[PDB]
Amino acid sequence: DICPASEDESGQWKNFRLPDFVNPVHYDLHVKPLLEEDTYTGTVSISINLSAPTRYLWLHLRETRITRLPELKRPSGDQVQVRRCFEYKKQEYVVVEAEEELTPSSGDGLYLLTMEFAGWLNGSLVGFYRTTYTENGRVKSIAATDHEPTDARKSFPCFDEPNKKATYTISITHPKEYGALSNMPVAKEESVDDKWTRTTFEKSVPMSTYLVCFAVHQFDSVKRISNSGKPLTIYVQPEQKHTAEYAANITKSVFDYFEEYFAMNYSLPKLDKIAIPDFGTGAMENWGLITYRETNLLYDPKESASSNQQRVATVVAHELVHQWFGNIVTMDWWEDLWLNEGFASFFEFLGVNHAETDWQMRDQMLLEDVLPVQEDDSLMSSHPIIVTVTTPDEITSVFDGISYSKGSSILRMLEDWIKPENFQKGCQMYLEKYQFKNAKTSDFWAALEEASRLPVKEVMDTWTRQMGYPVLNVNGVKNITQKRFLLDPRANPSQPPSDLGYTWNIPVKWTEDNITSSVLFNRSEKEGITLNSGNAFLKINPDHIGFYRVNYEVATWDSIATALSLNHKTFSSADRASLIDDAFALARAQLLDYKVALNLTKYLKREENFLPWQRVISAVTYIISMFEDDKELYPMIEEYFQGQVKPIADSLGWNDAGDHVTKLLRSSVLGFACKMGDREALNNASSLFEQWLNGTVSLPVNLRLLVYRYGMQNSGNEISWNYTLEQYQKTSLAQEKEKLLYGLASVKNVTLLSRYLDLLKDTNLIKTQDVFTVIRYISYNSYGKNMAWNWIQLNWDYLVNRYTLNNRNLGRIVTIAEPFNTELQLWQMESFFAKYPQAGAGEKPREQVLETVKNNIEWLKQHRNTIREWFFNLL
Numbered sequence: 001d002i003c004p005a006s007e008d009e010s011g012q013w014k015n016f017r018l019p020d021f022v023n024p025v026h027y028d029l030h031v032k033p034l035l036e037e038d039t040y041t042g043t044v045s046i047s048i049n050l051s052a053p054t055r056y057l058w059l060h061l062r063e064t065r066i067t068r069l070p071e072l073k074r075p076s077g078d079q080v081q082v083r084r085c086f087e088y089k090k091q092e093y094v095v096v097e098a099e100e101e102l103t104p105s106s107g108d109g110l111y112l113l114t115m116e117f118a119g120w121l122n123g124s125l126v127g128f129y130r131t132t133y134t135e136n137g138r139v140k141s142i143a144a145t146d147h148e149p150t151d152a153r154k155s156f157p158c159f160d161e162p163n164k165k166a167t168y169t170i171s172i173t174h175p176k177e178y179g180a181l182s183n184m185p186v187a188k189e190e191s192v193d194d195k196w197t198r199t200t201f202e203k204s205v206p207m208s209t210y211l212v213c214f215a216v217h218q219f220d221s222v223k224r225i226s227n228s229g230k231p232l233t234i235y236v237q238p239e240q241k242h243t244a245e246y247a248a249n250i251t252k253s254v255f256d257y258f259e260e261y262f263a264m265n266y267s268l269p270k271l272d273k274i275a276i277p278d279f280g281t282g283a284m285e286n287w288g289l290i291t292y293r294e295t296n297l298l299y300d301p302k303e304s305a306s307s308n309q310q311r312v313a314t315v316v317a318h319e320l321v322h323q324w325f326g327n328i329v330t331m332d333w334w335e336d337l338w339l340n341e342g343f344a345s346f347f348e349f350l351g352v353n354h355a356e357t358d359w360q361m362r363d364q365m366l367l368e369d370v371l372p373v374q375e376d377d378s379l380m381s382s383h384p385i386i387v388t389v390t391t392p393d394e395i396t397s398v399f400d401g402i403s404y405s406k407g408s409s410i411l412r413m414l415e416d417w418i419k420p421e422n423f424q425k426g427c428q429m430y431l432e433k434y435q436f437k438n439a440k441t442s443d444f445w446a447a448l449e450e451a452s453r454l455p456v457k458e459v460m461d462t463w464t465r466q467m468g469y470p471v472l473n474v475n476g477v478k479n480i481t482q483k484r485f486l487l488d489p490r491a492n493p494s495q496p497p498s499d500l501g502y503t504w505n506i507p508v509k510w511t512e513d514n515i516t517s518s519v520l521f522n523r524s525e526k527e528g529i530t531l532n533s534g535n536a537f538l539k540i541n542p543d544h545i546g547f548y549r550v551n552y553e554v555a556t557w558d559s560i561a562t563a564l565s566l567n568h569k570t571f572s573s574a575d576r577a578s579l580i581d582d583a584f585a586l587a588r589a590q591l592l593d594y595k596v597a598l599n600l601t602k603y604l605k606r607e608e609n610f611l612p613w614q615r616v617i618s619a620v621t622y623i624i625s626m627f628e629d630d631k632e633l634y635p636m637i638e639e640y641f642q643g644q645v646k647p648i649a650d651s652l653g654w655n656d657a658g659d660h661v662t663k664l665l666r667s668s669v670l671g672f673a674c675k676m677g678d679r680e681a682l683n684n685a686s687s688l689f690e691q692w693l694n695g696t697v698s699l700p701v702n703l704r705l706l707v708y709r710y711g712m713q714n715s716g717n718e719i720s721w722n723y724t725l726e727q728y729q730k731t732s733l734a735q736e737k738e739k740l741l742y743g744l745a746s747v748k749n750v751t752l753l754s755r756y757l758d759l760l761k762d763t764n765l766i767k768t769q770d771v772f773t774v775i776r777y778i779s780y781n782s783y784g785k786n787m788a789w790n791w792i793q794l795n796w797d798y799l800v801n802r803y804t805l806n807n808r809n810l811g812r813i814v815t816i817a818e819p820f821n822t823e824l825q826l827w828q829m830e831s832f833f834a835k836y837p838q839a840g841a842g843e844k845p846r847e848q849v850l851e852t853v854k855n856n857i858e859w860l861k862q863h864r865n866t867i868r869e870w871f872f873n874l875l
């Protein structure tokens with residue numbers, strides 16, 4: 001109550017954005033958690049470079065309270081008279097008004113502001129918090145922090161903006177049974193009591209608030225040493241110690257690869273990794289202390305899948321990229337978030353490709369980022385890569401497909417156009433230029449433009465300052481022209497307004513008879529260009545390397561189908577995936593007749609590669625989804641696609657054999673077989689499930705998920721549900737737990753799914769981090785599509801209270817409505833949204849799922865007969 005809230009607008013603290021004339025240099029931060037009380041206290045002393053006459057000093061603070069009237073120091077050292085302090089809620093500030101204004105730190109002397117604060121460790125996964133786990137029957141505690149993007153201000157009062165880089169010396173007073181970790185190595189350990197220890201860490205390099213991290217733990221460790229000679233260690237619960245090995249391997253390999261690739265030293269003396277037993281995102285790149293959700297870090301070769309292996313490798317690689325792109329060089333403002341996330345999403349594939357050679361990681365970029373985000377970015381409710389954000393809710397919202405995947409995709413296009421070698425050098429120069437400072441997007445262009453003298457800014461701005469992407473329309477084999485590709489044909493292609501008018505500078509690549517050529521397709525070529533060997537067939541956009549779609553003439557498309565039916569290997573696996581992906585997306589947008597798209601699938605009985613099958617399954621999943629309740633169309637589509645996978649499903653079999661990609665292929669191919677109703681695949685699932693219920697037999701790691709899902713679906717009951725629920729509690733491996741949750745969500749029983757939904761309110765059973773995962777799994781259930789949707793509506797106030805409107809996963813949960821395809825269902829959504837109109841971080845997802853559902857309704861109206869004719873005539 002000493003620093004109370006007031007609604008006083010008459011000041012610069014009414015501004016969302018922090019003032020230009022106040023900068024932090026150094027933070028002296030001390031915190032003392034009372035672990036078994038779920039509280040902490042702390043003091044922060046901040047050195048402040050003032051630049052203008054101000055009677056007010058303000059900075060960010062949320063939920064956590066100031067307990068003592070703050071103390072102000074002049075550059076000379078004198079005590080400053082402080083009249084009041086107060087909180088201004090609307091922009092998450094605490095403001096202190098001095099008696100008088102005093103002016104800039106002109107000569108190495110700085111102001112010093114000291115504040116005492118108390119906060120909570122409970123009810124939350126952001127800021128500074130405590131969670132528990134069980135070790136040899138005992139409940140143990142671990143405390144950690146999580147800040148990105150606007151949560152450092154919950155932990156301690158600070159200038160919570162990515163460009164207010166300051167240096168840190170952190171100390172923690174904890175009980176002696178615990179160790180304390182932070183960004184920097186331990187400097188000194190001193191006894192307060194015979195019970196308490198004060199751990200002081202050595203001074204940091206300049207860094208943003210969102211990167212500040214500390215933890216109090218009783219974890220064991222697995223150790224590695226870099227080529228730099230620096231200790232790289234993963235902290236892990238003693239019972240889980242053996243599952244930390246693989247992450248330790250990749251950390252070494254990828255750390256050593258990146259340091260060399262970026263031509264720059266890792267800035268800190270050590271690097272730590274730790275998985276928090278309850279953790280709100282996937283992982284977080286805190287300078288020197290990277291925090292993980294266990295599924296993304298901990299891997300067991302004897303129980304985890306190849307899928308899991310790759311996920312661990314990729315997230316680790318991702319988190320390591322950030323130590324350069326994000327940490328050393330940080331975006332100036334969140335609008336340029338892709339400078340962090342896009343770069344990490346691109347370089348992750350390079351890291352893991354170094355570590356794991358036969359994973360075809362470069363090709364998998366198509367499956368993971370490129371083709372999925374081309375779906376996202378064909379909606380009106382997408383946004384440009386450089387995004388205007390004006391609230392904390394808007395800031396957190398842009399941690400999405402666009403920042404990550406399109407970021408990754410347009411770098412993938414850029415690298416290829418500019419050539420890998422020059423892209424590398426260009427990244428290096430940017431990295432040394434803006435080291436320990438902040439960069440804008442223009443700065444990265446200017447850096448790469450110095451590596452190629454190609455018109456990088458001019459070309460890359462078109463991809464970056466407007467949403468969407470083009471479809472190239474082919475006239476007469478050789479003439480191309482560009483148009484915006486939108487999934488909704490009724491949508492206005494000029495909206496929302498763009499200076500660039502939705503035309504792009506398209507780096508174009510094409511293959512003529514195994515020889516490859518390149519052109520930049522200029523915006524100002526309004527009537528299109530012509531592509532420079534007298535030719536019959538011209539393969540445009542090889543390996544789908546550019547962020548665009550190609551619509552060949554119908555004749556060409558027809559010839560491609562026949563070419564696939566005669567010898568599909570004529571195309572590279574990536575090229576098959578891409579052609580199939582484009583055709584089905586073009587058909588979805590009413591730019592290509594569905595008969596033409598479906599014809600490309602006729603060859604599939606002989607398809608044996610991962611990439612094409614993945615993009616086939618993706619396209620079919622949607623079509624099958626739209627006809628779930630059509631008793632006439634569904635069996636026909638099912639019957640067909642069952643026959644098209646049967647050969648490869650049988651050939652690969654129900655057993656973990658072959659290399660990484662083959663094993664990934666088997667998972668999704670057997671899964672699709674099950675999905676399409678194959679009696680024999682379902683029986684394998686039920687048979688293995690029955691065996692697993694017998695309590696000894698350890699399932700083949702790459703088949704487990706399918707066995708739990710389809711086994712529970714086809715032969716699950718209360719006895720086996722209860723058992724599966726027991727198993728989920730008993731296993732320590734998070735990757736197994738998550739599979740078992742999908743199993744539990746698969747039962748065809750309303751009563752059991754109802755028990756499952758009730759468990760979501762029980763924190764001893766379902767972790768806070770997993771609630772949205774479980775809701776999503778249930779929504780995939782034929783019964784639970786409606787149950788999950790109904791439950792989030794009835795329990796909306798409860799979820800908002802538990803997570804806050806600022807939590808992006810809560811915001812995104814409405815996307816469980818994506819398969820909706822009737823006017824009735826759309827009315828439900830709109831009714832629910834009108835009832836709870838304060839959407840927070842859910843604002844964009846709402847817009848997106850509404851757009852999707854409307855498209856769905858239209859799609860059914862446009863294509864039901866055409867698709868029916870195609871299947872009926874064939875069968």
Ligand SMILES: *[C@@H]1O[C@H](CO)[C@@H](O[C@@H]2O[C@H](CO)[C@@H](O[C@@H]3O[C@H](CO)[C@@H](O)[C@H](O)[C@H]3NC(C)=O)[C@H](O)[C@H]2NC(C)=O)[C@H](O)[C@H]1NC(C)=O
Nearest residue numbers: 242243244245246247248249250252253299300301302309
């Ligand atoms: C983390 O990194 C290690 C290397 O940096 C991996 O390598 C393990 O260690 C052994 C030698 O370093 C390897 O040697 C042997 O390989 C041959 C196979 O032809 C066999 O003699 C043995 O299976 C194996 N030696 C053993 C088991 O003592 C192994 O290939 C290898 N594996 C094991 C279990 O030791 C680690 O595998 C790697 N760990 C993880 C989890 O990824």
Ligand SMILES: *[C@@H]1O[C@H](CO)[C@@H](O[C@@H]2O[C@H](CO)[C@@H](O[C@@H]3O[C@H](CO)[C@@H](O)[C@H](O)[C@H]3NC(C)=O)[C@H](O)[C@H]2NC(C)=O)[C@H](O)[C@H]1NC(C)=O
Nearest residue numbers: 646649650651653654679680681682683684685686687688
């Ligand atoms: C798990 O799935 C396997 C398929 O991937 C099943 O194996 C197949 O079983 C089929 C029937 O038992 C066989 O198909 C045909 O059987 C009839 C019997 O009357 C024969 O005429 C046909 O010649 C034969 N088809 C062919 C193409 O030869 C399969 O041959 C058989 N094997 C394979 C490799 O496909 C498993 O039975 C199933 N397991 C469980 C426990 O359900």
Ligand SMILES: *[C@@H]1O[C@H](CO)[C@@H](O[C@@H]2O[C@H](CO)[C@@H](O[C@@H]3O[C@H](CO)[C@@H](O)[C@H](O)[C@H]3NC(C)=O)[C@H](O)[C@H]2NC(C)=O)[C@H](O)[C@H]1NC(C)=O
Nearest residue numbers: 558559561562595596598599600602869870872873874875
């Ligand atoms: C691209 O798709 C085209 C449109 O579907 C294909 O052309 C169709 O082939 C069908 C064969 O599956 C034909 O259906 C047969 O003909 C009549 C339809 O009126 C029926 O009586 C027959 O029962 C049926 N055949 C069987 C075995 O049941 C269609 O006539 C035909 N449709 C049109 C509009 O021409 C192309 O073949 C396909 N191109 C490829 C694969 O390259």
Ligand SMILES: *[C@@H]1O[C@H](CO)[C@@H](O[C@@H]2O[C@H](CO)[C@@H](O)[C@H](O)[C@H]2NC(C)=O)[C@H](O)[C@H]1NC(C)=O
Nearest residue numbers: 037038039063119120121122123124125801802
């Ligand atoms: C952590 O727990 C404390 C108390 O255990 C919560 O504070 C209580 O809030 C409820 C209503 O929201 C009141 O009935 C109590 O009087 C409060 N207690 C105290 C001591 O203030 C606190 O809200 C929890 N923190 C979070 C983030 O949920």
Ligand SMILES: *[C@@H]1O[C@H](CO)[C@@H](O[C@@H]2O[C@H](CO)[C@@H](O)[C@H](O)[C@H]2NC(C)=O)[C@H](O)[C@H]1NC(C)=O
Nearest residue numbers: 716717718719721747748749750751752753755
């Ligand atoms: C779904 O599961 C419920 C819960 O187990 C089943 O209800 C049980 O049915 C058995 C046999 O008919 C009874 O002995 C139990 O008393 C019932 N339990 C409860 C809690 O009601 C139900 O039959 C299943 N529904 C299906 C398979 O459609």
Ligand SMILES: *[C@@H]1O[C@H](CO)[C@@H](O[C@@H]2O[C@H](CO)[C@@H](O)[C@H](O)[C@H]2NC(C)=O)[C@H](O)[C@H]1NC(C)=O
Nearest residue numbers: 717718719720721722723725751752754755758
């Ligand atoms: C499966 O698990 C449930 C939960 O433990 C069992 O317990 C019943 O749960 C319902 C609520 O869903 C309670 O109202 C009943 O009183 C519980 N029964 C008790 C305490 O005996 C359920 O019995 C289990 N079923 C099987 C077949 O194991």
Ligand SMILES: *[C@@H]1O[C@H](CO)[C@@H](O)[C@H](O)[C@H]1NC(C)=O
Nearest residue numbers: 227228229263264265266267
């Ligand atoms: C960069 O790495 C090199 C080689 O390991 C080393 O000699 C140099 O001191 C490093 N630069 C630093 C720590 O600033």
Ligand SMILES: *[C@@H]1O[C@H](CO)[C@@H](O)[C@H](O)[C@H]1NC(C)=O
Nearest residue numbers: 475476477478479480529530
């Ligand atoms: C393609 O463009 C060229 C050059 O503008 C022109 O000669 C030709 O007629 C165009 N049309 C077709 C179908 O090739």
Ligand SMILES: N[C@@H](CCC(=O)O)C(=O)O
Nearest residue numbers: 148149281282283284399
């Ligand atoms: N950069 C993190 C997400 C951080 C967050 O959203 O809290 C990741 O994608 O791994």
Ligand SMILES: [Zn+2]
Nearest residue numbers: 318340341344
């Ligand atoms: Zn990231």
